[PDB]
Amino acid sequence: SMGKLSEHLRYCDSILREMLSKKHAAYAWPFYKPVDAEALELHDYHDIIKHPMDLSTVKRKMDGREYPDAQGFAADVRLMFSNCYKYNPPDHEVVAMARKLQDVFEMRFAKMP
Ligand SMILES: CC[C@@H]1C(=O)N(C)c2cnc(Nc3ccc(C(=O)NC4CCN(C)CC4)cc3OC)nc2N1C1CCCC1
């Protein structure tokens, strides 16, 4: 009722709900919550990744309407993927998992009306 920007943000809300849903859990689960570098014994993670990002943080910010437009939302989602590509060996399973989830994200985002 408030126009294209309101509709875009609601569509992005729906993308996020799908990425968090059981449908994609085989590959999305490493991205549900912030990386716990202490628990994973990754003593270099925060030295390499300066801006951690994950789906629960995107959800908090999106629910608080902290993204001014859909491009702001997309930047944080893509930052999450980019962190995974930057930190891990390129042939690691987690990179393939990030790419499977990004395939979903980019497909849905491309079809935003
Ligand atoms: C932060 C680096 C990278 C990344 O980018 N993200 C996003 C990530 C997000 N979440 C996780 N989470 C878990 C990852 C592995 C395990 C696990 O159970 N590993 C077993 C432990 C015993 N044995 C060695 C066999 C394997 C549990 C996890 O959550 C509790 N891992 C992530 N990885 C991986 C971390 C090391 C390789 C890559």
From Swiss-Prot:
Cross-link Glycyl lysine isopeptide (Lys-Gly) (interchain with G-Cter in SUMO2) placement: 111
Tissues where this protein is expressed: Ubiquitous.
Annotated disease: A chromosomal aberration involving BRD3 is found in a rare, aggressive, and lethal carcinoma arising in midline organs of young people. Translocation t(15;9)(q14;q34) with NUTM1 which produces a BRD3-NUTM1 fusion protein.
Subcellular location per the Swiss-Prot or TrEMBL entry: Nucleus; Chromosome
Domain remark from Swiss-Prot or TrEMBL: The Bromo domains specifically recognize and bind acetylated histones. The NET domain recognizes and binds the 'KIKL' motif found in chromatin proteins.
Function comment: Chromatin reader that recognizes and binds acetylated histones, thereby controlling gene expression and remodeling chromatin structures. Recruits transcription factors and coactivators to target gene sites, and activates RNA polymerase II machinery for transcriptional elongation. In vitro, binds acetylated lysine residues on the N-terminus of histone H2A, H2B, H3 and H4.
Subunit structure: Interacts (via bromo domain 1) with GATA1 acetylated at 'Lys-312' and 'Lys-315'. Interacts (via bromo domain 1) with GATA2 acetylated on lysine residues. Interacts (via NET domain) with CHD4 (via KIKL motif). Interacts (via NET domain) with SMARCA4 (via KIKL motif). Interacts (via NET domain) with NSD3 (via KIKL motif).
Lineage summary: Eukaryota, Metazoa, Chordata, Craniata, Vertebrata
Domain Bromo: 3-112
Name of the gene this protein is made from: BRD3
Part of the intact protein present: 306 to 416 of 726
Family: Belongs to the BET family.
Listed name of the protein: Bromodomain-containing protein 3
